[PDB]
RNA sequence: GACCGAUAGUGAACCAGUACCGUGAGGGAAAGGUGAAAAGCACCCCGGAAGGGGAGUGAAAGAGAUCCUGAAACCGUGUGCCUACAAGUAGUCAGAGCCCGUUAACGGGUGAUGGCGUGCCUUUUGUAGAAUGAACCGGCGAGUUACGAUCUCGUGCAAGGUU
RNA sequence: UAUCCUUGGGAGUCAGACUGCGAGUGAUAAUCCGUAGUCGAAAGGGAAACAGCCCAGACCGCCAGCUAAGGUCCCAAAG
RNA sequence: AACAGUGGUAGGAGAGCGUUCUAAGGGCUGUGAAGCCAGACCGGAAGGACUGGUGGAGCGCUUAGAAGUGAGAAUGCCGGU
């Protein structure tokens, strides 16, 4: 702003005897390299909602998928080896061609490391579910144990 | 048609135009004779440009002399040099040393 | 006195009406000279209608 | 969409004597004829009048004492220059000029008015040279 | 973010100069005087679009007056007779037919005279 | 040669010509009949006092459109008052086929 | 990085606290872009040279050294219509004649004649002013953020609400 | 005839001008108060030109008609 | 539909047009994008298309969100003439 630009501090010139405009500083906002009026300043954009609102939101986004049978629940997910080819074969076995969200109980390293590189697949635990993630991806695959744990939490 | 152009000759416009107004649309020999008889600064430059155009027409495109006429001729302005002259009571004044481009295009009548 | 207002292009162009040059006096080449001036010498050899001088 | 007029017209020739008639009561009618308001093809921006010849212009008449009181002034643009003439001198020395002034003052100003005025011919006496044009006599309707 | 603001002012200013085509001298090149003149011609047209309505009635009246005086009537008497000899609703524009076909106009004048006396 | 009244105005029509008038609210293709016939010319002359009795003029419609745009702009000096808008006045084109006196 | 993109961002994207100014403390700039590759124009002609016209390289030479793009102010060459009797905030409405032919539309350019018509902003009871301001063009340039107070609207819950 | 009250949210304005009508002044030679209008914030028509006088309140288009103040010999429409 | 209304400075209220960035979908470009130039096209305004030339590699549409958000005047600043 006006008081942080290097320089200034004195009248530019006396500017008297010929009748020029009464300049006060060479860093005024209207000069060529002067300060900036208002403009951006560091701050943080973040607020919070009541807890019941968050619970209702997550319930609604979960039920919306069930409304149009976009939720596929399977007995269990198990990969002996962390191979992306195996994960691609599993996805192709089902009718999953767009971005999909994998939900598993606790945390499985093999599945997380096998589906990591596929462009549209994201892996989260039952504790890490959220509205934006589930509302973004199209098809949600969830382990039955994860279903039970999510039911218990809410 | 044959063209000859001189770029940034140290001569101000509005002074070369006076001479160029005399030789526009006339025959080549008459134009050269006119240019040889007027005591002004731009005449030697314009004569050289005209003769260069004549030589280009004769050599490159295989045209004929004694049959050419000055179809096009004009003077444009170019880059300007700015200088300063001191004046009384500690003041300054600006001086513009101007430059011009000269173009001549001859053709068979 | 300083000008009260600027002058338009039309007035300037109309003022420059009489500011032009004149076509010189054209005569014969003296002693096969090059198209000399009236009452003067040939450009080639300073000739007076064939009467060379200087 | 009415019809204007453009160069496809004819101009007649009329002769009016000024014996006995007063100045204004004749000048008004003559000016109206000159502007061309007496024909149904009138047009503001085009000359549609006729040619008016006046004879016996020296026998004009004025009512009251105006003949010795109406004064014509003019200025020569020099300081102190203001020339005056009584109506009697104007009548007995320049009879045509008085009629011309009276009629001219009654015509619109501008280019068309001054071009309209060129159709008026005023003669002192009872003789005019306009014979090849075959003038037609015209009495003052008003 | 920062909006530099280019490419918008030129597009808007160029449209003003396009309506000023045909003006005398610098009024068709410089933006400020062009804008001043285009605004002034804005209400010069509104004023004249209503004067035009009352500038042709005058022409029609003058022509009808001349044509009627060619018959011995005047304009006022002819109009009163027409308004009274029945009505024959006839705008002055359509009674201008004295110029084209003079015979019918004489018939109308004859009817008006017949009722007027 | 007939003088008809339409659209709050009066026009003169002879068969074979085309005229532009105010909107007739008629779809392009059908036939309209004008009833207000004031004058009839040519050979015999008929002058109806309000109207000529038993006279109808026939025409057909082929186009309904709008005229060229007129931009209305007004302003007041020194008081900062501007106003701009546009206008395109509708019209209907018809050609006469029978005066039908 | 819902930060800037060469008048912005550090004063400084470039030999910058440099050039320059002042005895001294001190003040303090302007200036980016050939091409994928120098393949940066051998050779011929005019010219003292600079600069041009051919030939050649290259997709492009109208990319040839301040070299991507190249607006406005300003300066010129050619031409269709008008102009040497005319009084002018020069435009608008009506209108002959002449020249053209479009995003085909009750088309385009010019314009003799007729009517009307005292620029823009600011301020004042009131301005055509002889009250202020602008030579012209281009770029930059003025109601925001944080914390409190009160009111309207929306959503969740409800004698409870909420970290 | 359709305006009025209460509550709550935002304002701007703060000792204007002229012309008629009734009272008191300088010296009824620029003033004072009460009352009405217009301009301020209002274009159009008439007073030759003329914020305050007379008629009258502009959403836009039309080459349609009737009138107000004021007018009808020529400028300039109408006896 | 039928009635009624639509001059306006300081001000109060409402509905809209444009510019840069972010999120998803949908899709245009070397068979020529942004920018610049010309035109007799379209909406009630702010404005938006369509053809042709130049240009030589990036841009836009629909729905939301955030603002260094729109210039004719400050004897404004810088540059060019």
| DSSP conformation letters of A50-104 | -HHHHHHHHHHHHHHHHHTT-EEEES----SS--HHHHHHHHHHTT--S-EEEEE
Integer angstrom CA distances of residue C29 from B48, B51, B65: 22, 20, 19
Q: Any idea which architecture B1-109 has in CATH? A: Alpha-Beta Complex (3.90)
Report phi then psi at A112, rounded to 5: -65, -40
D42 chain-E contacts, CB cut-off 8 A: 59, 62-63, 66
Residues 6+ apart with CB under 8 A from A140: A65, A70, A71, A72, A100, A101, A103, A134
Asked if residues E92 and E58 have their Cβ atoms less than 8 Å apart, the reply is no
The secondary element (H helix, E strand) that includes residue D33 is: helix D23-35
Residue F67 burial (10 A CB sphere; 0-12, 13-18, 19+): exposed
Q: Report the Cα–Cα distance between both ends of chain E, in Å, rounded.
A: 90
Per-residue burial over B26-35, b = 16 or more CB atoms within 10 Å of its CB, e = otherwise:
bebeebbbbb
Q: How much of chain E is in helix, strand and coil states, percent to nearest 5?
A: 70, 0, 30
CB contact under 8 Å between C35 and B33, yes or no, is: yes
* Whether A140 contacts A65, CB under 8 Å: yes
Q: Which chain C positions have a beta carbon within 8 Å of E26's beta carbon?
A: 8
* CB contact burial B36-62 (16+ within 10 A = b; e otherwise): bbbeeebbebbbebbebbbeebeeeee
Could you check: is the Cβ of residue F77 within 7 Å of any atom of nucleic acid strand H? Answer: no
CA distance A3 to A6: 8
Does the beta carbon of B33 lie under 8 angstroms from any beta carbon of chain C? yes
Residue D11 carries which DSSP code?
A: -
Instruction: List the determination method.
Output: cryo-EM
Euclidean distance between CA atoms D10 and E7, whole angstroms: 62
| Residue D65 distance to chain E (closest CA, Å) | 35
Rounded to whole angstroms, how far apart are CA atoms A25 and A7? 9
- Our count of domains for chain E comes to 1
**Beta-carbon count within 10 A of B2 CB:** 21
Contacts with A142 (C-beta within 8 Å, 6 or more apart), sequence order? A71, A72, A73, A74, A102, A103, A104, A150
Four-residue CA torsion sign, A87, A92, A98, A103: negative
Q: What are phi and psi of A6, to 5 degrees?
A: -65, 135
SS3 labels along B23-55? HCCCEHHHHHHHHCCCCCCHHHHHHHHHHHHHH
Neighbours of A90 (CB within 10 A): 17
Give dist(CA F69, CA F78) in Å, integer: 29
Q: How far out from the chain centre does Cα C54 lie?
A: 24
The Cα E44–Cα B39 span in angstroms is 57
Say how far apart CA B70 and CA B107 lie, in whole Å.
Answer: 7
Q: How distant is C1' of G158 from CA of A59, in Å?
A: 21
Task: Map out the domains of chain B as residue ranges.
Answer: 1-109
Residue D32, φ and ψ in degrees, nearest 5: -60, -40
HSE-CB for F88 with a 13 A CA cutoff = 6
Q: Which domain holds residue E1?
A: 1-116
- Tell me, what DSSP letter sits at residue E31? H
Length of chain C, in residues: 54
- Between vectors from CA B96 to CA B95 and to CA B97, what angle results, nearest 5°? 115
Range of the domain at A135: 1-154
Query: In the 8-state DSSP scheme, what is residue F47?
Result: E
Residue B75 class from Cβ within 10 Å (0-12 exposed, 13-18 middle, 19+ buried)? buried
Instruction: Please indicate whether, in this complex, the C-beta atoms of D2 and E66 are within 8 angstroms of each other.
Output: no
Distance B80 CA to G31 C1' (A): 19
How far is B5 from E6, CA to CA, in rounded Å?
38
Count Cβ atoms below 10 Å from residue B79 Cβ, excluding itself: 9
Is beta strand D13-17 parallel, antiparallel or unpaired with respect to D136-137? parallel
- The C-alpha atoms of residue B96 and residue B81 are separated, in whole angstroms, by 6
Largest CA distance in chain C: 61
Q: Do chains D and E touch (3 or more CB pairs under 8 A)?
A: yes
SS3 D2: coil
Sheet holding F31-34, edge to edge: F18-21, F90-98, F57-66, F31-34
Give the gap in angstroms from C-alpha F90 to the nearest C-alpha of chain E. Answer: 18
**C10: buried, middle or exposed (CB in 10 Å: 19+, 13-18, 0-12)?**
exposed
- Laid out side by side, the sheet with B2-9 consists of B2-9, B100-108, B68-77
Chains touching A (3+ CB pairs < 8 Å): none
d(CA E33, CA E26) in angstroms, rounded, equals 8
In the sheet with D136-137, reading across from the earlier edge strand, the strands are D120-122, D51-55, D13-17, D136-137
- Any atom of strand G under 7 A from CB of B75? yes
Beta carbons of D17 and D56 less than 8 angstroms apart? yes
Interchain CB distance below 8 Å, E96 and D42? no
Q: How far is CA D123 from the centre of its chain?
A: 11
Phi-psi sector, B75: left (phi>0), alpha (psi -120 to 50), beta: beta
**Cα separation of B90 and B96, whole Å?**
20
For residue E40, give how far its alpha carbon lies from the nearest alpha carbon of chain F (Å): 8
Q: Which nucleotide has the least CA–C1' distance to F8? A: H64
Q: How far apart are CA D65 and CA D73, in angstroms?
A: 18
- The C-alpha atoms of residue A139 and residue A72 are separated, in whole angstroms, by 7
Chains B and F touch (3+ CB pairs under 8 A): no
B16 touches chain C (CB under 8 A): no
**Closest residue (Cα, C1') to G94:** E52
Pick from B30, B64, B23: which is nearest to C34 by CA?
Answer: B30
Query: How many angstroms separate the CA of B15 from the C1' of I11?
Result: 64
CA dihedral C22, C28, C32, C35 (to 10 degrees): 0
Mutation test of the interface with chain B: which of C15, C18, C21, choosing the one with the most B Cβ atoms within 10 A?
A: C21
CA A148 centroid distance within chain: 27
Q: Roughly what angle, to the nearest 10 degrees, separates helices E102-116 and E75-84? A: 70
- The values of phi and psi at residue C51, to 5°, are -90, 90
3-class secondary-structure state, position D71: strand
Task: Please tell me the distance from the alpha carbon of residue F20 to that of residue F94, in angstroms, as a whole number.
Answer: 6
Instruction: Give chain D's radius of gyration (CA, Å).
Output: 17
- Report how far residue D106's alpha carbon sits from residue B46's, in angstroms, rounded to the nearest whole number: 65
- Is B21's CB within 8 Å of C21's CB? yes
Give the whole-angstrom CA distance, residue F66 versus residue F88. 6
SS (H, E, C) D94-137: CHHHHHHHHHHCCCCCCHHHHHHHCCEEECCCCCCCCCCCCCEE
HEC string of C7-42 equals CCHHHHHHHHHHCCCCCCCECCCCCCCCCCECCCCC
Whole-number distance in Å between F57 CA and H37 C1':
57
DSSP B57-107: HHHTS---TTSEEEEEEEEEE---EEEEEEETTTEEEEEEE--EEEEEEEE
What is the DSSP-derived secondary structure letter of residue F63?
E
Task: Kindly state the DSSP code that residue E42 receives in the 8-state scheme.
Answer: H
Phi, psi of D109 (to 5 degrees): -85, 160
**DSSP letters spanning F7-37:** TTEEEEE-TT-EEEES-----TTSEEEE--E
DSSP single-letter state for residue C6: P
Query: Do F69 and F14 form a contact (C-beta atoms < 8 A)?
Result: no
Of E92, E85, E87, E89, the residue nearest E65 (C-alpha): E92
> Helix or strand or coil: residue A27?
coil
Contact between residue A8 and residue A27 where contact means Cβ atoms under 8 Å apart: yes
* Pairing of β F2-6 and β F37-40: antiparallel
* Number of domain units in chain A: 1
Contact status, residue A61 vs residue A29, Cβ threshold 8 Å: no
**Chains C+F touching (3+ CB pairs under 8 Å):** no
Nearest neighbour of E39 by CB, restricted to F5, F9, F75: F75
CA dist list (Å): D80 to D73, D76, E30: 13, 9, 49
Cα separation, F25 vs F87, in Å, equals: 20
Could you tell me how many CB contacts below 8 A there are between chain D and chain E? Answer: 27
Of the CA atoms within 13 Å of residue E82, those in its CB half-sphere come to 21
Q: Measured in whole angstroms, how far is the alpha carbon of residue A22 from the centre of its chain?
A: 52
Last residue before each break in chain B (C–N > 2.5 Å): none
């Amino acid at each position: 702003n006006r008081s942080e630009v290097r320089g200034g501090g004195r009248k530019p010139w006396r500017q008297k005897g010929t009748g020029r405009a009464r300049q006060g500083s060479i860093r005024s906002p209207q000069w060529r390299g002067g300060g900036v009026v208002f403009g951006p300043t560091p701050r943080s954009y973040s607020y919070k909602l009541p807890k019941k609102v968050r619970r209702l939101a997550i319930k609604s986004v979960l039920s919306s998928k069930v409304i149009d049978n976009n939720i596929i629940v399977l007995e269990d997910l198990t990969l002996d080896t962390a191979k992306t080819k195996e994960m691609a074969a599993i996805l192709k076995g089902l009718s999953v061609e767009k971005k999909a969200l994998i939900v598993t109980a606790d945390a499985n390293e093999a599945v997380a490391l096998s589906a990591r590189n596929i462009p549209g697949v994201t892996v989260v635990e039952a504790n890490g579910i959220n509205v934006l993630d589930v509302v973004n991806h199209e098809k949600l695959l969830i382990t039955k144990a994860a279903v039970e744990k999510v039911e218990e939490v809410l | 048609q044959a063209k000859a152009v001189a770029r940034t000759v140290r001569i101000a416009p509005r002074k070369a135009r006076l001479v160029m107004d005399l030789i526009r649309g006339k025959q080549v020999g008459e134009a050269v004779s006119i240019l040889n008889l007027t005591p002004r600064a731009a005449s030697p430059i314009i004569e050289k440009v005209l003769k260069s155009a004549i030589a280009n027409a004769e050599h490159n495109y295989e045209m004929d002399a004694n049959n050419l006429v000055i179809s096009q001729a004009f003077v444009d302005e170019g880059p300007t040099l700015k200088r300063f002259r001191p004046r009384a009571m500690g003041r300054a004044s600006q001086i513009n040393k101007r430059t011009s481009h000269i173009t001549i295009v001859v053709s068979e009548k | 006195a300083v000008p009260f207002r600027r002058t338009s292009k039309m007035k300037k162009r109309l003022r420059r009406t009489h500011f032009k040059l004149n076509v010189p006096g054209m005569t014969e080449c003296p002693s096969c000279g090059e198209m000399k001036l009236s009452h003067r010498v040939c450009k080639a050899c300073g000739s007076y209608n064939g009467k060379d001088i200087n | 969409t009415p019809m204007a007029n453009a160069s496809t017209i004819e101009r007649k020739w009329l002769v009016v004597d000024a014996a006995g008639k007063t100045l204004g009561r004749l000048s008004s009618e003559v000016a109206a004829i000159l502007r061309g308001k007496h024909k149904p093809t009138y047009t503001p921006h085009v000359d549609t009048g006729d040619h008016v010849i006046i004879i016996n212009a020296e026998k004009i008449e004025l009512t009251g004492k105006k003949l010795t009181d109406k004064i014509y002034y003019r200025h020569t643009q020099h300081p102190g220059g203001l020339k005056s003439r009584t109506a009697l001198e104007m009548r007995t020395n320049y009879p045509e000029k008085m009629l011309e002034l009276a009629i001219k003052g009654m015509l619109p100003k501008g280019s068309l008015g001054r071009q309209m005025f060129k159709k008026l011919n005023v003669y002192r006496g009872s003789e005019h040279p306009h014979e090849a044009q075959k003038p037609e006599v015209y009495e003052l309707r008003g | 973010p920062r909006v530099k603001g280019g490419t918008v002012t030129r597009k808007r200013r160029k449209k003003v100069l396009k309506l000023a085509k045909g003006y005398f001298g610098s009024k068709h090149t410089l933006y400020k005087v062009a804008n001043q003149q285009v605004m002034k011609s804005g209400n010069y047209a509104f004023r004249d679009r209503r004067q035009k309505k009352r500038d042709f009635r005058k022409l029609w009246i003058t022509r009808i007056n001349a044509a009627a005086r060619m018959n011995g009537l005047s304009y006022s008497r002819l109009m009163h007779g027409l308004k009274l000899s029945g009505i024959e609703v006839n705008r002055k524009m359509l009674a201008d037919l004295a110029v084209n076909d003079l015979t019918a106009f004489n018939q109308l004048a004859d009817a008006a005279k017949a009722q007027l006396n | 040669y007939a003088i008809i009244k339409t659209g709050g105005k009066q026009i003169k029509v002879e068969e074979g010509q085309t005229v532009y008038i105010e909107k007739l609210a008629a779809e392009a293709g059908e036939t309209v009949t004008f009833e207000d016939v004031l004058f009839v010319g040519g050979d015999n002359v008929k002058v109806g006092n309000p109207t000529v009795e038993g006279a109808t003029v026939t025409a057909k419609v082929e186009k309904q459109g709008r005229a060229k745009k007129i931009t209305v702009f007004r302003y007041k000096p020194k008081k900062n008052v501007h106003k701009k808008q546009g206008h395109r006045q509708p019209y209907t084109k018809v050609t006469i086929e029978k005066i039908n006196a």
